[PDB]
């Protein structure tokens, strides 16, 4: 039996598949960052980063759904072993923030390519993703700022960890 | 500051970390099988397999949580790319069933090692996982049986795909 | 058309089929014990034992369901007439208590074999069964204790029957 | 202490005890047939026959209750193991339909003897049983008819098993 | 009149009785640790340890119920005077955590013996206990970690005590 | 940091700490009596005594709370093992009633010392305890009276055990 061809162009297909793989990669990175926090008495940051890892996987699934719907083969690559050694809470959120900036940038590139190729169905689909990613980028910016403001003298790490705990719990519900 | 050592033994740690990586790998395999179905007009199997991949990732997450709680470092390794070449619906479910068998065996192994080690916190923890995995293996056995019963004569693939669709919809 | 092979090992299959048959036999025994009580003015004990017979059959059915889901042929053997001659209430519950001990022993043996062969799906499945059987065994122990405490003298049989009647009714 | 004699006549007692054992044997037969279907990818027929087996045991229980109520000893006899080898779905339902006919005939025989011996208490009690057995016999005729109508060509077996599955589920 | 013999084997009987006595002993120890905290201005830790003492007694009662049900005589031994002198909050939770590890270990020994002797009714009964004890062990690990993270410079003891207070109140309801 | 001194006098502290240890001891005694009953077919008395031991521990806890609130160190001493040798139901309740009498006397002593010391915070606090203890002593007097009224002739022990069971059930 004959099935219909992919409904998206080859360039967009490639970019969307790469984005699926990026989100999968992010999910692993944040799981690893989470584990570091949990094994260093920072269960607030642990929980936040675990829940964030899970959310990145939710993004990957939403992208896959769109690919499936459009008759586009999903091409899952080898996911690389995440960084597992970190210096401290500040370095983790510095790295995480830099990571989210890169994700934001790669999204902008797909959206820009959708415009250039006049693929406005893909442009429209991506809007929820642009919005949620921007909110995520701002949140990491905000936590990094707060970690820097608190500092890690006496019980500063405890305070910073409880602040992050409060954010994680407030976002569950 | 001093953080408490891992609360689990080195052997158990190794086995549980390995299992996390196995579930991640299963999730990718099923998304790959799911996409093969969708791109070959089998959105019923496609749906079922997608939903099953997401469930494998849920098992991965619950394993991670248990490691985190026991102060055990989570050791995520490179996840090799899943196979993407399939001959048909029957082959996908034959591969899927053999896969669930291997996953069931790997779980039995950990549970047995927990018993050897007298680690009954881990034994107790793994019980939902043993249960849920058995349900999964049965389900794949049942679907495989049904695909084979229907066969691939005139509109047989359609009937099989509708059947799997019904199951996917009833489980969510 | 091709159906999948049984999902359990030969020895587990054998033990589990033997157990289905033990439960079927138990139901027969308890019906006959129940009838003896009913024809000897002991309707309270009759009711208790009738309801317990029915629950043995429920256990047989739950085992059969598990055999079905694992693609295991259920092999029912010949039924031999249950013992039908009894001496009195005390003897019936003595025999019953001893029978329940034997049922507990045979379950423990299946569970122990599940561990030895690392069949943790079966081990996990049998847990409700281990728990319910133990509750049944404790109950027969309790009733036998009470029958002895009360005695056979001067409306003692009436009081013991009313006691067992109360238990039967409260378990509905 | 003196207990009252059986309230039914010896011939009626005999026929009623025979009937209890026939229902026990029916339960066994249908469990075996059910298992056959389950192990040959016919879970729809499997479920139907399992549920029907359990209902035959319910019939046995209600007859036993009536014997208990009339101070009649229940005499459970030895029964051969049920047939376990079958040729296919059609053969199973042919055998089952022939079996339901025999049960129907056996009930009519008891009812007729109740009329002849002026045992109208027993006649009255058996009316629920006559009505339910008739409904069962009709159901088996209908399923057998539908199986032959569908046939065994390509996916006919699947369509037939799905039809029986819908009946099983709708009967609760 | 004749009563039925115990339904459990002599080895399991002995182990279960010893476990009842261990839980009773724990209850006293935690009452004593609680009193120390209350008399040293640490009412948060005071409350937590008091509620925990009470929970250990709940465990002992559940074990006794099972013994009673099985016609096994309950053999209560002399309960020894608990440690009453402690150095500080950190030492108390270090001791408590070490204590919970020992309890966890003794449970594993009973469960292991149940398997060896094929006593699967006892194996099954003990599962709630394995689960609750593991949760307790993890909780003490978590509090010890947090006490160490906070430290006791300036008002660190106050912060640590309020953290424990929050845990105690959240577990009541 | 400086923590405030105890808010109670040394004599009161001594008496209240002693009372905590007395309640702990009572709890163990009653669990011991409770187990004697259960192991001798008296699950009614067994239940009642178990429930009463748990209540003695509740009194211990409320005393501890009051000491904690007043910044008084709690001084738990070695709790001697309770007696385990009993001759029968009557002896257990004879011992139990004499025990509750001694506990009532010990409470009266503390309350009297509170009055001598003008410690009316403690006097006021102890009022629920005086009340609840009196109710307890009456109850044991009532049960002892009833056990003795029933006596131990043919099924008398059963009737007494059922009576105490009713009380236990009505109080929870
Ligand atoms: Fe993101
Ligand atoms: Fe993202
Ligand atoms: Fe699975
Ligand atoms: Fe799995
Ligand atoms: Fe067709
Ligand atoms: Fe039983
Ligand atoms: Fe049973
Ligand atoms: Fe019928
Ligand atoms: Fe019938
Ligand atoms: Fe504990
Ligand atoms: Fe504990
Ligand atoms: Fe008292
Ligand atoms: Fe008192
Ligand atoms: Fe009397």
Short mmCIF file of C-alpha atoms and ligand atoms in Angstrom, two decimals, chain A residues 23 26 30 52 56 59 100 103 129 132-133 136-137 140, ligand 1:
data_model
loop_
_atom_site.label_atom_id
_atom_site.label_comp_id
_atom_site.label_asym_id
_atom_site.label_seq_id
_atom_site.Cartn_x
_atom_site.Cartn_y
_atom_site.Cartn_z
CA UNK A 23 15.23 18.48 23.92
CA UNK A 26 18.47 18.71 27.61
CA UNK A 30 19.01 18.41 33.72
CA UNK A 52 12.45 20.82 34.45
CA UNK A 56 11.88 19.20 28.31
CA UNK A 59 8.44 19.35 24.63
CA UNK A 100 18.55 27.71 27.75
CA UNK A 103 17.83 26.41 23.05
CA UNK A 129 7.10 26.54 21.99
CA UNK A 132 7.16 28.42 26.87
CA UNK A 133 10.88 28.49 26.08
CA UNK A 136 11.93 29.01 30.89
CA UNK A 137 14.89 31.18 29.85
CA UNK A 140 16.73 30.45 34.86
FE1 LIG G 1 13.96 24.90 27.89
#
